[PDB]
Ligand binder design. Structure first.
Ligand code: NA
Ligand code: NA
Length: 327
DNA sequence: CATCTG
DNA sequence: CAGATG
């Protein structure tokens, strides 16, 4: 956690680059398990040789550590921090819709900067477009004050449309979190479930409404269960307009809310732990449900859940406020 | 994983 | 459809 740091770090650089610049998924995947192992490692790796001893750890990686440990640096790494192309591939990705695949292409096309991206605005797709449009807004953290505001809205309107809607703004926002990155909204309705043969309108109605009243600016993606968009806080009385925000809205049958619900909130860790425990108690939990684990190895069949309480209950555990879900 | 693009 | 993005 602090003894094998730098090492685990450089590796992560290394691991990144492979994937991003190169394509060396193998090589990438490689550093990863490494940094992952040197990670758990109880001691203070003092040499390559020492490391090598470890799994995932091989000769090439070994070699690397030695240099790093030897000298406060890595040539390979220093090389890469200079390489503009590499640079540029990292840069471009910053944009929504722009993945690395896309990254290269544009680079190779000699587009590398923001200006570059504007000039060839044609070359970008829809999402890619919004992305560039809202580069700044996007990189901006969402503070609670706005957070709670938005929440009020979304919550309100959904109400208007149907009384059976069940909105839930999960995320760190749900954990207390002083600032968020985006607005993750869980959604369900009773007339929606496991068997209940589709009903896309469910999702679609509310969407319309938000754009109706203007909460929502653009569309990233709009499927039959997951919308991906942009929103905004009605600039009160002109002088201070709001950043645009990333907003996701997902439909879910009512027969599996609370888990998604649970899950979506987190944190990752809280999950694992509770996931870990659940295992103990003789059950399983993943995003959609919690099943009774038979002894035959594994086994299942759905458990009925009317709330988060209901989950924890099963696992015979202390109902923890979303605030204390931290770990 | 769910959606999009081409 | 394979394939990219989130
Ligand atoms: Na990106
Ligand atoms: Na293939």
């Amino acid at each position: 956690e602090t003894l094998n740091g730098g090492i685990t770090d450089m590796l992560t650089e290394l691991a990144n680059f492979e994937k991003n610049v190169s394509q060396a998924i193998h090589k990438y995947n490689a550093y990863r398990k490494a940094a992952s192992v040197i990670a758990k490692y109880p001691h203070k790796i003092k040499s390559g040789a020492e490391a090598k001893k470890l799994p995932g750890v091989g000769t090439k990686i070994a070699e690397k550590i030695d240099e790093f440990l030897a000298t406060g640096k890595l040539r390979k790494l220093e090389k890469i921090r200079q390489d503009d192309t590499s640079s540029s591939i990292n840069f471009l990705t910053r944009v929504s819709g722009i993945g690395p695949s896309a990254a290269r292409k544009f680079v190779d096309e000699g587009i590398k900067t923001l200006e570059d991206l504007r000039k060839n605005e044609d070359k970008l797709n829809h999402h890619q477009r919004i992305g560039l449009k809202y580069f700044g807004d996007f990189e901006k953290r969402i503070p609670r004050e706005e957070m709670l505001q938005m929440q009020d809205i979304v919550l309100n309107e959904v109400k208007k449309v149907d009384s059976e809607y069940i909105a839930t703004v999960c995320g760190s926002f749900r954990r207390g979190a002083e600032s968020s990155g985006d607005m993750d909204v869980l959604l369900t309705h009773p007339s929606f479930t496991s068997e209940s043969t589709k009903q896309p309108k469910l999702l679609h109605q509310v969407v319309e409404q938000l754009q109706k009243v203007h909460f929502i600016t653009d569309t990233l993606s709009k499927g039959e269960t997951k919308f991906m968009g942009v929103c905004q806080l009605p600039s009160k009385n002109d002088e201070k307009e709001y950043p645009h925000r990333r907003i996701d809205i997902r439909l879910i049958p009512k027969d599996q809310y609370y888990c998604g619900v649970l899950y979506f909130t987190g944190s990752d860790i809280f999950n694992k732990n509770m996931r870990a425990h659940a295992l103990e108690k003789g059950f399983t939990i993943n995003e959609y449900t919690i099943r009774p684990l038979g002894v035959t190895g594994v086994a299942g069949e759905p458990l009925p859940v009317d709330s988060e309480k209901d989950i924890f209950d099963y696992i015979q555990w202390k109902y923890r406020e979303p605030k204390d879900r931290s770990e």
